[PDB]
């Protein structure tokens, strides 16, 4: 079998139309969730900083965001990752704190019974 790439420009267009389709549904919030900053796990790459999967629970507790609130305002949680050093904790705590500064959370209507 020989795989051909004639749909390469048609996949590019289809993926872009999905981003536009996604943005139409969720109008003002970002098309991606904020990702942490981590360091790759080798002696070849540990100097580089890249994006992680989600923020650790210890990073969210320091930033002031609970693990149940976090998912609702676009902050992924990684229950697996941990902070073995204070630099990873502070690098990503500041990342969450900056995110909260630039964030507008629209209020939600709440059911409110008469008494009690």
């Amino acid at each position: 079998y020989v795989k051909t790439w004639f749909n390469q420009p048609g996949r590019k267009l289809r993926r872009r139309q999905a981003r536009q389709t996604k943005a139409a549904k969720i109008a003002p919030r970002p098309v991606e969730a904020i990702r942490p900053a981590v360091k790759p796990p080798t002696i070849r790459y540990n100097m580089k900083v890249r994006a992680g999967r989600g923020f650790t629970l210890e990073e969210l507790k320091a930033a002031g965001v609970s693990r149940r609130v976090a998912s609702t305002i676009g902050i992924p949680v990684d229950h697996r990752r941990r902070n073995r050093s204070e630099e990873s904790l502070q690098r990503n705590v500041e990342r969450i704190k900056v995110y909260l500064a630039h964030l507008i959370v629209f209020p939600r209507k709440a059911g409110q019974p008469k008494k009690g």
Partner: protein, 67 residues
Amino acid sequence: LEEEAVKKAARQSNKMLPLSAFEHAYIQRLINKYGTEDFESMAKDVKLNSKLFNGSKLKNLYIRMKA
């Protein structure tokens, strides 16, 4: 967008709750015997505190009754 969020949050800000007929009569009876400051002995009275509410729940009941 920011103007709408603050004004709407101000409109939906009535977070304090009133008391129902049972809730008011419940907390009122506890206060009439133990005053308004001793909530620890208020929770330990099995006769009047049938639901066994702790001091923190009874404190929140009194606060909601004040307003």
